[PDB]
């Protein structure tokens, strides 16, 4: 993971690595690839609440459980 490819991706990555705890992330990584329970992936969705007025509810966080997945789901 030298860069994510939208600045969408750019927050989530952010997001990502503080509420999950990591450092650095790729981009359609998986939020359970090494953290626990799923509060953690939701703060992201939280945080493209946020950042977004985007409707992105855990379900959605499940089908698209990942940086590209997510910042694709807010960026388009």
């Known amino acids: 993971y030298v860069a994510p490819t939208n600045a969408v991706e750019s927050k989530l990555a ?3 690595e503080r509420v999950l705890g990591v450092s650095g992330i790729g981009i359609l990584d998986n939020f359970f690839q090494i953290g626990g329970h799923s509060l953690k992936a939701m703060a992201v969705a939280a945080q493209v609440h946020r950042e ?3 409707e992105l509810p ?3 966080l499940f089908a698209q459980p990942t940086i590209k997945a997510l910042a ?3 960026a388009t």
């Open 52 to 54: 977004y007025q985007v």
């Open 58 to 60: 855990l379900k959605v």
């Open 72 to 74: 694709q789901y807010v």
């Open 14 to 16: 952010e997001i990502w």
